[PDB]
Structures are given as C-alpha cells and as structure tokens.
C-alpha cells in the first residue's frame, strides 16, 4: 500500500527510463555521482543531460558507469554496505534477503523491469536488480552489491534470464 507510494516518492526525479522506439526496457540509477546502466538494455536516455556523456564499460560486472556533474551530486540516491537479513522495500512491494540472497515471490517479473534499485526502511540503496531466475514458488535475483572493503560483488544464481 504505502510502500509503493514511498518508492514512487523516492524514485520520482532520480530514476530515468530507457526508451527504445517508445518501449520502456530498463531504468538507470544515479547514485554517488555515478550513472549505473546495464549492457543488455539498449536505447536512448530520456534525460537530456545524462544522454550526452560517455559511459565506461564493464562487461564482467555487467555495468556501464559515468560521472555525474557536481550540480546534481546532491540529488542522488544514498548507498550503504551495512545490511542485516530480513525484509526490504522493492517497487513491486517487498523482497526477502536470506543467506545473502534476494528472493521475490512469484506473480511479478517480466522483460523491462531491469535496473530498479532495492531500498531499505531508511532510504538507502542496497542492491540493483539486473536479472531473475524462477525457483519453485519464490524467484531469486541476480544483482550487484557492495561490501565493507569496497569491492563490487555481482551475485548470479544458476540459469538466470536477463530482464
């Protein structure tokens, strides 16, 4: 109920969709002065400022990143590495964090909702949704996250389908 409204209020201005002949196939992320955007989602950036840049690539970590200018670094997402197990907020409701794995209940999940960040009860991004795999009743996510040392860890289960 109110969780989706809080997601729409937090991700209103900072989330920009990716257009491809009128089709919405992905979402970029503006956090820490960096613009995260995946490889398989191909299209034009809806924002005029973020589209006229050059994104350095990382095909192993499946991420394109760029440098957000200084006049927009205050209006970004927050990020942290301290995260316990339990529940977190996602755009379609809740997501479970168990044994270092993000799980989403079934019914939701198609092609197009790639790049949506995972939020917490305070308002900090803990993961970035990149893919998903159907596991019985409860699907698992293939995402990226950080740690205490500062190494971007990409978690990928078996036989995932890119969204």
């Amino acid at each position: 109920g109110k969780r989706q409204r809080m997601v729409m209020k937090l991700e209103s201005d900072k989330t920009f969709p990716i257009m491809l002949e009128g089709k919405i196939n992905g979402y970029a992320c503006v956090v820490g002065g960096k613009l995260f955007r995946p490889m398989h989602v191909e299209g034009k950036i809806d924002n005029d400022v973020l589209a006229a840049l050059k994104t350095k690539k990382a095909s192993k970590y499946d991420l394109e990143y760029a440098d957000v200018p200084q006049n927009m670094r205050a209006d970004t997402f927050k990020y942290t590495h301290e995260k316990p197990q339990g529940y977190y907020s996602w755009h379609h409701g809740a997501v479970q964090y168990e044994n270092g794995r993000f799980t989403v209940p079934k019914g939701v999940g198609a092609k197009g909702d790639s790049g949506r960040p995972i939020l917490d009860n305070q308002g900090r991004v803990v993961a970035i949704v990149l893919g998903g795999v159907n596991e019985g009743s409860r699907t698992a996510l293939s995402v990226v996250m950080w740690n205490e040392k500062g190494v971007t860890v990409k978690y990928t289960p078996e036989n995932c389908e890119q969204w």
């Binding site: 040392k149 190494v151 860890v153």
Partner: protein, 49 residues
Amino acid sequence: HAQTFTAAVSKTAWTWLTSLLGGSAVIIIIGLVLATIVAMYVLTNQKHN
C-alpha cells in the same frame, strides 16, 4: 676433418639465442603467474558478499 652442425656457433651467439629465446618464455610464464594471482585475489575478495 668433418663438419658438424652447431660447429661454428660462438658463446656470444649462444648468449644472444638463450637470453632472447628463453627470456621470452620467462616473461610469458610470469605473465601467467601474475594473471593467476590477480584472478585469485579478485575472486577471494568476492567470497564475502
């Protein structure tokens, strides 16, 4: 007398063969060891999550 193969090769010529033919193998195997150490270190820091 009777000629031999590698009969007129000098110790200078053996040096310029060896230091440029086995030294390339030394450089490629330390490239392999460096790549293996980098791969193990990056995979080792990933194991925490």
